[PDB]
């Protein structure tokens, strides 16, 4: 008798948690692994007192997150269930929530049990990771459906959702961003889905974690891309070359397919008007453009490192750009002015030293041979010692 | 329309009476008659110059010169195998070399020579792989006469000094051209432990440089000899050498480190216990590598920049790069060695390696990988080397900034 006076003890204060958190540790010791029965049991009880005592009222809701903070760890889940404790917690929650922290805190401590874990088979079968995937999507869906929906009637009760729902869901990328990036790719291709996404995204990418590198797979990237070649909207737009500035160290692979995009795009943002702004693009794909009313990371870094790497197709492009375009088999989209170009560009290029490059390789054997990329080991242990040095 | 005979004429005139300009004008018109190389024709041209060269030698300065300057201007033409090398090794190369003609013009136009055959874009420009072999042939040759040529003991030095100088030259030359190859001829020779000092000589001078490509070299299992030459032998001189090699070597390895890592500690250790009285730690095993002591009865010149390569740096190396397996070894090395299953050979004090190494600690930033890995996830986990690509794109980006 270990369970039978742990359910003593809910049922005591779901109307201190002192006596019920002994309970539960003295329960684990008795049960270290999770018990299903034990569990099944258990998550019964619980649909029984949420009829006697609901969500309604705030003092109703400390409580609950305290308690099922601390039984949580003792249960076994399902995409069924998390539904169930999404419709009648985690929503209801986050739809207006409650303006004491700690009380939030709990109910991150709650949604990143389900959502960070060591072990996967630690419920059995693949339910540890059904039950994260779901709460992630909900979590995301939710976010996006909240970023655009026109309000009517709070406007600060708004802002308070979307306060919560990006702090938890930035917090899922530093540690989850493949997944997270995975979560926003069919939202991405919904154009006001977009400034909302990167916003988020790039204050992940701005933490600099691991493992930015998985992004590209999910193909987000070829997205951001595209963002950055087509839409109009200077706020997003100036939001999308942050992102690709700020992941572009964590590649130098996916740098061979998407460098003719990457000049384009730096001919784009050095052409940026005043009156006109950006230059519109014309072939679009199947893109569907944003436009801004529908009805200090700035291109100098993006020049640097492209005149790094691959300088002699940089300063080959710029000089006549829509010639190197046939040749290189693609369309300048953009209507755009060279004399510009060849003075803006200019000024940043005096200020970088030359390159040894243009001693060794042409420019067909820059793009092709991959002999250079051994030149990086060399010096980069080099650099990390003088990294290590004090003084 | 004739070709060859009117250059025969050309030639046989020019070795009786030092102008050239027709032997050239003879070799350009041939050159457009015969683009590549004709086979009928080195046959009858050699021929010829046999002939020649019984009636006018090497002997004095003055017929060398004319040999050199005229082999320089027709050797494009000829094809030789790589029994004809040993023709032009006994009768123009080996009398050169052995006693040379002290006149930097006629060096220059045998050196012309030698690194014609030696380095060539082509490898059937000759048929078959006879470019390649004469190549493979000469090279052996010049390294086998560099090594006998430097223990040989007693041609009044200065003779003796004039070989080597100019040995030298052509074996460095030669070397960052084509180290993969160099490399692979010093193996054998380098067993025999009084090559060593002289064979390290050339190869730290290559190594200086920094030219390309010398990511090959360990596949030569040169870079494993050299670790041998650290791990046992006694010989200040050839010591420093070693760990010279060693550390110009690491930035282009970082592969062979997951099978050089050990040893290297091993060293660390050893370069690092080094006493005024008793020098280097001895070898207590050597396996049958065949040291090397200092005098073993009972050049030199060490060159100067190569000074600063001691192993303070061999720790700013394995501080990075492995600073938790590197730190763990340096505390009790015995018990780190058994465990990663290899034994230290050297008696050591420790308290002085604690004494010592602290010191060099202090002068460094702590570690991020303490907050990452344990000692076995740094030791296995291959992703650890991403975050490498990233760090080396930001460190080229801010050389290339003028300020």
Not at 183 to 199: G, Q, V
Not at 282 to 305: C, K, P, R
């Amino acid at each position: 008798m270990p369970l039978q006076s742990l359910v003593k003890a809910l049922w005591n204060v779901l109307h201190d948690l002192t006596e019920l958190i002994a309970e539960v540790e003295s329960y684990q010791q008795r049960y270290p692994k999770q018990n299903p029965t034990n569990s099944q049991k258990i998550r019964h009880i619980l649909d029984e007192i949420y009829e006697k005592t609901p969500f309604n009222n705030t003092r109703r809701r400390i409580l609950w997150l305290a308690v099922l903070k601390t039984v949580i760890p003792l249960l076994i889940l399902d995409r069924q269930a998390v539904g169930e404790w999404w419709d009648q917690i985690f929503f209801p929650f986050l739809n207006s929530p409650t303006q004491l922290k700690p009380v939030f805190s709990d109910l991150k401590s709650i949604l990143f049990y389900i959502l960070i874990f060591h072990d996967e088979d630690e419920w059995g079968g693949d339910l540890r990771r059904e039950c994260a995937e779901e709460t992630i999507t909900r979590l995301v869906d939710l976010y996006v459906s909240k970023a655009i929906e026109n309000l009517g009637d709070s406007q600060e009760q708004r802002n308070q959702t979307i306060e919560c729902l990006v702090n938890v869901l930035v917090h899922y990328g530093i540690q989850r961003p493949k997944e997270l990036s995975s979560c926003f790719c069919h939202h991405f291709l919904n154009p006001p889905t977009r400034i909302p996404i990167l916003s988020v995204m790039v204050e992940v990418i701005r933490r600099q974690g691991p493992r930015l590198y998985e992004i590209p797979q999910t193909g987000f990237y070829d997205l951001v891309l595209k963002c950055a070649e087509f839409d109009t909207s200077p706020i997003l737009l100036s939001y999308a070359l942050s992102f690709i500035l700020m992941i572009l160290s964590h590649i130098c692979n996916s740098l061979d397919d998407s460098l003719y995009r990457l000049f384009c795009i730096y001919l784009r943002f050095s052409m940026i008007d005043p009156t006109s702004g950006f230059p519109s693009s014309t072939a679009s794909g199947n893109w569907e453009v944003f436009h801004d009313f529908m009805s200090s990371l700035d291109y100098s870094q993006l020049f640097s490192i492209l005149y790094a790497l691959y300088p002699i197709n940089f300063l080959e492009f710029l000089r006549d750009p829509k010639l190197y375009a046939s040749k290189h088999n693609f369309q300048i989209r953009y209507s755009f002015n060279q004399e510009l170009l060849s003075t803006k560009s200019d000024g940043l290029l005096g200020r970088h030293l030359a390159h040894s490059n243009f001693l060794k390789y042409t420019a067909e054997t820059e793009l092709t041979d991959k002999s250079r990329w051994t030149r990086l080991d060399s010096i980069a242990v080099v650099a990390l010692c003088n990294s290590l040095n004090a003084v």
